[PDB]
Amino acid sequence: MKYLPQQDPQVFAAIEQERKRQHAKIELIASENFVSRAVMEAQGSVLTNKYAEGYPGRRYYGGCEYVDIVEELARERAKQLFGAEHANVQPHSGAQANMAVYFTVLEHGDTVLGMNLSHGGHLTHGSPVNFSGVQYNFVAYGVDPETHVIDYDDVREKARLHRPKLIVAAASAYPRIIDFAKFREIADEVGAYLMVDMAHIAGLVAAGLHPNPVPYAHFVTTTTHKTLRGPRGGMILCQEQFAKQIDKAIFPGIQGGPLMHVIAAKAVAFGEALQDDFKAYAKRVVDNAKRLASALQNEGFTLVSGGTDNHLLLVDLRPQQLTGKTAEKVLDEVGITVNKNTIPYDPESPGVTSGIRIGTAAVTTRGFGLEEMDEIAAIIGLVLKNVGSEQALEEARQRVAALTD
Amino acid sequence: MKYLPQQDPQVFAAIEQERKRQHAKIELIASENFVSRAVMEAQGSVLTNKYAEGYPGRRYYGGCEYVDIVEELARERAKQLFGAEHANVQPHSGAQANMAVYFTVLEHGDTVLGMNLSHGGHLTHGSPVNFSGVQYNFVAYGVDPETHVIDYDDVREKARLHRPKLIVAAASAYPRIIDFAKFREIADEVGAYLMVDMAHIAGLVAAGLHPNPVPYAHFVTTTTHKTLRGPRGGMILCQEQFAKQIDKAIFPGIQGGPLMHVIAAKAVAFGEALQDDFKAYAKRVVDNAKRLASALQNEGFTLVSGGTDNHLLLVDLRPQQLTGKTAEKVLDEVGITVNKNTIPYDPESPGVTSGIRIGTAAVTTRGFGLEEMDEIAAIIGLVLKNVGSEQALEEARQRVAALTD
């Protein structure tokens, strides 16, 4: 940076702290990643200056010829990545992407069927303190109490009982492949739309490592910043039949001016995802997660569902008589970043939990491989089996530093 | 830029076109401005990588110590700028800032009283194709048919008749000072909350050139990217009594992860606005608008309300037998960027209009003064009085180029 250090020493010092923090820690928050310098440069461009309400070639402001090129690049590359008939790259976030789909097909008070939030469903899939649960009548399906795999007969029963207008599939903390074909079959049985929120798994889908929801779902929502490794924001994919309605839902429905610089950054990220090396990256993410899962099991940990098919895993800490809150805190002390996370049928509150959620997307981006996964698991074992030993924690600290260099 | 040109030639070429366009044109879109290089660098930082749901010291993710510093800098500087008791710097946009306030105090179907959209009110102040008009029951007050000043007796009558839960003051196309004291008096009479959407005038308020709504309003919303000259995004100000509710409305209510890099950019912009030179800048904006108004009147143009108290003006093109659409198009041909805009009591549709909206914030940022305002008015006169003369348009083109260098 050249101008920020002089203009704003306070902001610059804090940004520098954050940059150094991102290098020093072992980042295992499953929703996080590290964007490329190209993505960041696009976000830091003069495109922030442009009002561009509307869509390419159909804007409500003059002078949009070039931001139109940028938005169309984003849309076309997204369609190439996911094989979708239509893309809307304007959503400000995952929240707004989901909000727009709900606004498109539902009226206030309509019934929606989503994944149980404490089994892996997201805030925007019906929390009573979120617009989703306040605006629409959410009901929930669960995972099997033993296998922790989505119970598709429960999806079906809930759908047949409650008769939702919309069914939502996908999750913030589900470690297995989701069967979109079965969701669509159930949706078809009850005459419901199917929305798939692929936010977490989007990069894996792009790389052919998770089944693609696009051919099965009426609407696919996603963030651009998780396994897709792009800037912070949202996106909607859908068939041409819903294109006009979806676009109108984003604008003039729920947003105003789009963030053209972020949209540029989206285009860049999609371009990166189209490359062969991104496919190799995504395979390493999944390979690393499986290796980490196996290594943690070797350390004596129980995993929700018994492992992972994707980028993330959930440790059930009940065998260790630890809460997720306790584990999160102590791991923070040694430089490992995880989230406390409810496990299916958790006896603890969401503020406490019996689990920790871990993902490999970020560490894989920084070049971690199988050997590093073994060591991460070993350090987690050392820490969680010796929470009261400051010497154990100091050893962990040194081993974490050894990994981040 | 260093990495983008190599990684993504297509995106880079389009960004470069846009950068050059921003230099070449006379930018008179009233909602636009040019951010500093420091603001852009903050947006292009690694802060995009950080999930930070929640608030400073009260986050749902570990490792937020430094993004907390950044967000608190934004909040404290905003409070210093506007004298507000509380700031929420997380809203992704003006849309989301307004959305959150509505979510805080209203239930589905509640009556809200806002400015007539064709008299200057914004999309999010009750358009039937926007969430505001779909979710809540909007009624409207108007300006006087002759003076084009808000009719405060109409505000009062509408309030007493319809009994709104909330009154919204502020506008996207109102060239005069708004009397927030009168709005609060009316709000008090009917037991309604008062929200002021100061998006357009925020920089002028910060500079003491427009009365501050903060002491009169329960909630003040704004964008950060208009006269405030910051990054693209939203903000909410309110008294401490509503702080908790407002914060909960933004998260977990209507958003998820905030854009920490944009929040950094907000802090930077607020820091710039706190400086003496920003006050001088804002005075030049208002001085320039008054000069431009006078100069246009000298060219024979009629202005809505007969001039301006702020950064923007509205030309009533009926005396010239031109539509706003026609004027917008021909000015585009010569390198002057304006919006078609409905005038109060417009006989034309919103797709056609009888007016153009012009603002001086952007041209003032690039260093334009009073002499430049005279020349801009002269060029607009030359163009709009000679729409059928290609030689006149070519002369205009050359004079525009002369201004932008």
Automatic annotation (TrEMBL), chains A, B:
Pyridoxal 5'-phosphate 2 binds at residues 51, 93-95, 122, 172, 200, 225, 257. Its EC number is 2.1.2.1. Residues 5-380 form the Serine hydroxymethyltransferase-like domain. It catalyses: (6R)-5,10-methylene-5,6,7,8-tetrahydrofolate + glycine + H2O = (6S)-5,6,7,8-tetrahydrofolate + L-serine. GO terms for cellular component: cytosol. (6S)-5,6,7,8-tetrahydrofolate binds at residues 117, 121-123, 240, 349-351. Keywords: Amino-acid biosynthesis, Cytoplasm, One-carbon metabolism, Pyridoxal phosphate, Transferase. Pathway: One-carbon metabolism; tetrahydrofolate interconversion; Amino-acid biosynthesis; glycine biosynthesis; glycine from L-serine: step 1/1. InterPro entries: PyrdxlP-dep_Trfase, PyrdxlP-dep_Trfase_major, PyrdxlP-dep_Trfase_small, Ser_HO-MeTrfase, Ser_HO-MeTrfase-like, Ser_HO-MeTrfase_PLP_BS, SHMT-like_dom. The modification N6-(pyridoxal phosphate)lysine is found at residue 226. GO terms for molecular function: glycine hydroxymethyltransferase activity; pyridoxal phosphate binding. Pyridoxal 5'-phosphate 1 binds at residues 51, 93-95, 122, 172, 200, 225, 257. The record marks 225 as: Plays an important role in substrate specificity. Pyridoxal 5'-phosphate 5 binds at residues 51, 122, 172, 200, 225, 257. Catalyzes the reversible interconversion of serine and glycine with tetrahydrofolate (THF) serving as the one-carbon carrier. This reaction serves as the major source of one-carbon groups required for the biosynthesis of purines, thymidylate, methionine, and other important biomolecules. Also exhibits THF-independent aldolase activity toward beta-hydroxyamino acids, producing glycine and aldehydes, via a retro-aldol mechanism. Thus, is able to catalyze the cleavage of L-allo-threonine. NCBIfam families: PRK00011.1 (NF000586). Homodimer. This is Serine hydroxymethyltransferase. It comes from Geobacillus stearothermophilus. The lineage of its organism: Bacteria, Bacillati, Bacillota, Bacilli, Bacillales.
